[PDB]
Design a protein around this ligand. Structure first.
Ligand code: FES
Ligand code: FES
Ligand code: FES
Ligand SMILES: [Fe+2]
Ligand SMILES: [Fe+2]
Ligand SMILES: [Fe+2]
Lengths: 360, 360, 360
């Protein structure tokens, strides 16, 4: 009916699944069950039992298999029926759909592919250096649902230079995109507007914000943020990721970790990190207010100061065709820098005009 | 997909739009923004910005243009992009859909037409003599949504003689329809039932109610009501109008103004007018109870005492075909009078039977 | 669009319809009105009036006809317009859809058939011996709606031997199905599990439960239950029935009557019957928890201990084809006994293992 993106998708944080009860996720137009085996590893299958349609997510784990609450059949992490407890044997074709998993960076990922193939080794989610380490906090994480929109409308932001001023209240002084293979990257530097105070990580006019944000596949973005304040620089890592529930609904997730400042107690270091982590969340929530309130546009009208929207969408298209049909122009290295001079000039004028009105 | 009526449609009262923030209206299967320019005149455009789909209704007005809250592009009342503030020029094709407006009788109207043409001069909404005048009150106005029905099911009432007895508790003693060009008219006179007391303008058995109600196009009806009580006659004007939200939902609006009785103080004159205005609203709300609870019928079964339903629907059909395809039988003057003698005889009998039971 | 089962369907208890106002039932993809005539007999018609679509369920009864609340036309139990009170005659084709009724066992049934034929005499609902009698209680009855599922998913339970252990906490020691003509029967005997206490009629490990449950057509099941406790045996009768609201929603109803134990006062006999009646309801509510939480399966994966699912569905299919197309294999007597030995052996082991853990 409706085609979902081939790639890694994060279903949430490991710590929310290791408990070791089963969990339901509505995703990819169906329902999924997540459960830990006896060795604590996570498994993902279609939630609905292939016997008579019982809900495996409402079952319990027994050994290394999930047990259906209707007639107690047992399904393992590869989708195989390991036992029908009241029958001599298992019909030889007792198999359901199993999703390949990846546990990394304190998160759970599943591989989706309509063609039914496994993830190739060169398509993965990178290890975030610093995670699982006293130096860095643990994820502050949040989640919501957006309806009436596509996943792609989030991805469109990769190339959106102008919204940094209007939505994040900052001047994007450097802005560059690089699309290559199965990744899409935004590099940008900003300083905060003097005519606005809102407690985000974009706020400070005295600090330069340096951002490198990359989609590792269609659904998962890691944004490395450095805020140079005084001599010292605050390092954070923001995750922006999504997965489709249906053709018309998706889950959007975002989380932050902050690097602890050294030569200070834990009480104070962990308290200030949390303080900055909230600022990052608030920045992200500025995008959310737009994303919850906007129509899709297949044929956007573009200005000379727009980022490379059509090339971004071309790159993204690779994840919605069969791998044999992916073309060179989708995956070949493409880069584009916007000279932000004109925009910043317009913006600095406007901000000066505001500041003049603020006093007199 | 689904075709909406060509014609003037009232979106509400001017005073609710002159404030001068933007307003959203869900109508004609899309979302609209209404906003005042610097000279206070109202403008209507599609709400969704043609750049990347931001919601203009959630923006602000700047001069004579609405400003998108996503990247601040500026759109004027003719749908032209007047400025991209951070870019040198406006792409030469920067245009969105603009709706032609009419401000009159303290209300805002928009012209809808699938063929995309402007309103011809001979198709308009007449000036209501008496509006904007100390002699007459201002609109008491109300609004609601009806789902699971068509606009046409409201229009069907033009020819419904019998419902005056069952729904408005009155005897329709005179009843006539005239359809002509783009108007459809109901003339009727009534007196109230003695066996029922409910505080509507149809209630009084001693007063004769005279009504002339005309659809000026497919969506907007003005009903001139005169209630002859004693020597003196109370004059009111009721509006019944609608506009479609989707193929399956519409907004129904109704409002009243009353002429102030002279030779009395303002406190008392304005207080009694309001008193009568409520009676009119209550009468209208009797129709609403039916309209919220009734199925559409494409092939109604008709009695010898029904009004000219098929001719009414034929007239109405003109608004759902292209102007080149409108036929003579749709627009040619048609009139039909129901002789209400038989019905009134049946009704007066039944009412007498009730009154006999009331006492003994 | 979507085809509903030909057969008797119970709309509820007679006592809820004899009052003698009209009642609406949403069923078979439309709305229905139920009303008592002057002799107290019940009538069922489409709710929407064939004049202009008024809601007959919101009308009142006048003599032997329901009166539309919009223009007061009168419709009798055979769907004929008996009067247009304000008109000389009734158009000669004034007919709406009438549903054939059956009042029996304190319940109201309607005959549905897409082919528009009347119920044949040999297809009926049997008189429940004991109903309407001091010896037996009156129906304790309950009702709910299930969405996202088909009627058939309830019917699938006829052949579900295994769920008695997992869902009703009992050992099915005897289990047999017989399908024949337009009936489908489940015979089973059980004893309760010692490792579980929940206050249902399946609970007692010391009592043998004997059940004979038969679908008399596609929608209505009567289950004769005998619980042999001590010397004395408790007799109950459970009804499980349904009717479709739409293709995607249905109403599920269940009720119980209990036979009063003799040689005891009424206060105590009626109090204990009610006590047992609740136990029966709780048992049924165990199925409801599964039925509210399960996906349809067109191609169920079956074990060697499954009941004859495909033959059951073949039998059921007769009610969704035209009577001329019903085949011998649908209606020919078919019987199947499951030898429950292996399952009970597995189950008794598992239960012993639990009991061992319970103590130590
Ligand atoms: S439905 Fe899952 S075991 Fe029967
Ligand atoms: S979406 Fe309207 S200005 Fe960019
Ligand atoms: S709609 Fe039923 S009588 Fe007119
Ligand atoms: Fe952003
Ligand atoms: Fe009316
Ligand atoms: Fe059951």
């Amino acid at each position: 009916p409706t085609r979902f993106a081939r790639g890694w998708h994060c279903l949430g944080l490991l710590r929310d699944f290791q408990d070791g009860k089963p969990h339901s996720i509505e995703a990819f137009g169906t329902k999924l069950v997540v459960f830990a085996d006896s060795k604590g590893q996570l498994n993902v299958l279609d939630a609905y039992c292939r016997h008579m349609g019982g809900d495996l997510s409402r079952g319990e784990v027994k050994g290394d298999s999930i047990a259906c609450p209707f007639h107690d059949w047992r399904w393992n992490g590869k989708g195989k029926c390991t036992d029908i407890p009241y029958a001599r044997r298992v019909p030889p074709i007792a198999k359901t759909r199993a999703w390949t998993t990846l546990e990394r960076n304190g998160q759970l990922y599943v591989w989706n592919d309509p063609q039914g193939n496994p993830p190739p080794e060169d398509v993965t989610i990178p290890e975030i250096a610093g995670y699982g380490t006293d130096e860095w906090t643990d994820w502050s994480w949040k989640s919501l649902r957006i309806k009436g929109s596509h996943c792609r409308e989030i991805v469109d932001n990769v190339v959106d230079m102008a919204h940094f001023f209007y939505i994040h209240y900052s001047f994007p002084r450097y802005f560059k995109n690089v699309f290559e293979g199965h990744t899409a990257t935004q590099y940008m530097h900003s300083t905060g507007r003097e005519d606005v105070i809102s407690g985000t990580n974009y706020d400070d006019p005295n600090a330069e914000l340096r951002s490198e944000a990359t989609y590792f596949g269609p659904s998962y973005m890691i944004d490395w943020l450095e805020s140079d304040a005084n001599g010292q620089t605050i390092e954070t890592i923001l995750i922006n990721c999504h997965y489709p529930v249906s053709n018309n609904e998706f889950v959007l997730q975002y989380g932050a970790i902050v690097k602890k400042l050294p030569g200070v107690s834990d009480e104070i270091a962990a308290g200030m990190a949390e303080q900055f982590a909230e600022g990052v969340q608030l920045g992200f929530e500025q995008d959310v207010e737009i994303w919850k309130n906007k129509a899709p546009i297949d044929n956007p009208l573009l200005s000379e100061e727009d980022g490379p929207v059509y090339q971004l969408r071309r790159w993204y298209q690779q994840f919605y065709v069969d791998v044999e049909d992916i073309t060179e122009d989708m995956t070949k290295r493409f880069e584009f820098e916007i000279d932000t001079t004109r925009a910043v000039a317009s913006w600095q004028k406007e901000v000066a005009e505001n500041l003049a009105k603020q006093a007199e």
